[PDB]
Design a protein around this ligand. Sequence first.
Ligand code: 05B
Length: 274
Amino acid sequence: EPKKYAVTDDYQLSKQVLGLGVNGKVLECFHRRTGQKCALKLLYDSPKARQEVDHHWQASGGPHIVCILDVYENMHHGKRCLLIIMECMEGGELFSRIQERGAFTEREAAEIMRDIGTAIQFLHSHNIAHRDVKPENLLYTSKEKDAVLKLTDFGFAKETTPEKYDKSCDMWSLGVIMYILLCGFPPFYGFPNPEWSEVSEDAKQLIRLLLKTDPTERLTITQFMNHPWINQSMVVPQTPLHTARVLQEDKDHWDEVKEEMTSALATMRVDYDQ
Ligand SMILES: O=C1NCC2(CCNCC2)c2[nH]c(-c3ccnc(-c4ccc5c(c4)OCO5)n3)cc21
């Protein structure tokens, strides 16, 4: 079902970029029939590019997953290309929105984790491990208060049809993202004062269960969603965290935390390590 006629018959392309994947640059575009601003990911054809589109297609109705609108197979400067047209996520990255504020609460963190959990729940019950869940891939649909948090970039995704191992990498990501959400800095562990002094014990113990060095002891997604901090997120205490202040104060090496997490996730994807 890829459209084989030229993308620019349906879309007006901008010379204006919204970032790079591992498979593809992301550009802004406008649907020619309607107003709509959308995002275009350019992949050069290849087995991987094909699996990326396949995996993202399957995931694209699910909760808190960036939706694809259309896929094109085109020639571009004489190379085959696949073009994934996605809804525009103009709210930008999760941890940038948290920065732009000056209170961020433990309850709001459990609501965000539950949303990402429901993405991972959808993917794993469909036997898809994402394997690159990290800040840059967690985007909001708009800058408004009712914006929806969604996961994107299925470039490293594997259809677990090892399986169990690949899913456990997503679960580690959830523990890393949660840790950062609760204090403003990553586990590269411990929970130091005063940033972790008021964090509830349920939160700490769920992170502990998620960052187990042994993958087989790590919580499953269904055990994550049934944990009281996630399952009873409405009633998590409304306590002010120091996350947004710390992110503002540490903004000058936010790029290093992202590089580190990218590197840890690449290392989890190797066939033989250590
Ligand atoms: O698969 C993707 N990989 C690359 C990135 C994430 C890592 N950082 C560079 C871009 C990415 N971004 C998107 C994407 C999809 C839809 N919308 C947007 C988007 C659109 C408008 C935006 C925006 C993000 O940030 C604020 O304005 N990005 C997909 C991908």
